Structure 1
Amino acid sequence: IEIWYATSEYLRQEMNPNFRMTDPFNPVHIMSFSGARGNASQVHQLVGMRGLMSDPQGQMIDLPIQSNLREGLSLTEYIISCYGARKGVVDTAVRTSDAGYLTRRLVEVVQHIVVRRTDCGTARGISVSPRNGMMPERIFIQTLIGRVLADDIYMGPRCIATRNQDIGIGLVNRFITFRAQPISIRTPFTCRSTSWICRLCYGRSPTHGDLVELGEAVGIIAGQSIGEPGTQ
């Protein structure tokens, strides 16, 4: 199992260098590098080696596949390959069904939530620190974009941001340069009711890039958003 995995993996690693150095304009490279179609794994199978396969019950089969589709798989190899294919077909059918149940149920819990008021009046906010979790800067940025601040942030005697101000990528970056660690943000968990939300707590809309308007169905959008990525 080990000798064969290493051989397959080295070959995959070396495919891109070969194309970029020796044949830059080959059709297979253009299609993959561009982003148009193909994935490195898919190409590896056409031009390298298909590799070790997993039998039902998760056990490797012990006969390596040393061939690619151009060269042509042997009868024995083809049969082993079929194993994987039944797994895919069974998974696709199942995944389509499971997703729908999760979505129906998620919409039901949160269907009633609409934005009904401008300010709840809360003076509480969650605090986000770069530390307190080991957070890659990416995570820190993504949490913060789109939220309204619940307290002023100051560097020395100057105010970087004031309460009731939205945070965008430029502000987030200033906070990173100046290392302002405790930032307090209004968040759905900080609002004063459970039958509705306020504009300031929810924050900027994903669609139009401005504060959410009164009358929007935040709940139906949340259910759908968690669920649709489910097919993948």
Structure 2
Amino acid sequence: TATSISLGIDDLLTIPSKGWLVQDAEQQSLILEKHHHYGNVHAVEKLRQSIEIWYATSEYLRQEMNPNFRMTDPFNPVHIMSFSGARGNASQVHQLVGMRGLMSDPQGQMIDLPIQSNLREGLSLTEYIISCYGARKGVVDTAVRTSDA
């Protein structure tokens, strides 16, 4: 009560290298699409390359999230809540201050469209529709899990 920790809009701090990484990733994706239209690569190579590069970018962002908070803003409220253990997790804070990465569509097939925006910047319509797949799976999983347990 004395300290009165709180969370605000500007308090969700992204790593200082998200822009460069997303830009080079989308540049490589565009180059690969252009060469696929030319015929240098086929469909499965493009799919693998896109999935792998976006998964690697999301994983590197989540990995660099914590050291950035520890070094630059050690007393950040989100960092305090995550490190103390009160509420939150590395994955959940990654959704807030990083990126949501590649959600998986129903039937275990990757959507192939990356969610390059977090909840602070604001998702697009397509990214929100994609996250609806995860939400439906989550709620039906909750119901079936309760019944089976």
TM-score range, shorter chain: 0.5 to 0.7
TM-score of the aligned structures, taking structure 2 as reference length: 0.66
Aligned amino acid, residue 19 of structure 1: F
* C-alpha displacement of 1:5: 0.3
Aligned amino acid, residue 57 of structure 1: Q
CA distance in 2, matches of 1:25, 1:33: 10
Corresponding position: 1:21 with 2:71: yes
Aligned amino acid, residue 57 of structure 2: T
* C-alpha displacement of 1:15: 0.6
Displaced runs of 4 or more, over 2 A: none
SS at match of 1:71: coil
* C-alpha displacement of 1:85: 0.4
Corresponding position: 1:6 with 2:56: yes
- Which residue of structure 2 aligns with residue 41 of structure 1? 91
SS at match of 1:18: helix
- Which residue of structure 2 aligns with residue 224 of structure 1? none
Matched pairs, number:
99
* C-alpha displacement of 1:59: 0.6
Aligned amino acid, residue 18 of structure 1: N
Identical counterparts, % of pairs: 100
Q: Could you report, residue by residue, the CA deviation over 1:82-107 in whole angstroms, capped at 9, with x for unpaired residues?
A: 000000100111111111xxxxxxxx
- Which residue of structure 1 aligns with residue 115 of structure 2? 65
Structure having the higher helix fraction is 2
CA distance in 1, matches of 2:135, 2:64: 27
* C-alpha displacement of 1:30: 0.5
Superposition RMSD in Å = 0.5
CA distance in 2, matches of 1:91, 1:64: 23
* C-alpha displacement of 1:60: 0.5
CA distance in 1, matches of 2:89, 2:115: 20
- Which residue of structure 1 aligns with residue 134 of structure 2? 84
The gaps in structure 2 that reach 5 residues or longer are 1-50
* C-alpha displacement of 1:58: 0.3
CA distance in 2, matches of 1:54, 1:67: 16
SS at match of 1:86: helix
Tell me which structure has the larger Cα radius of gyration: 1
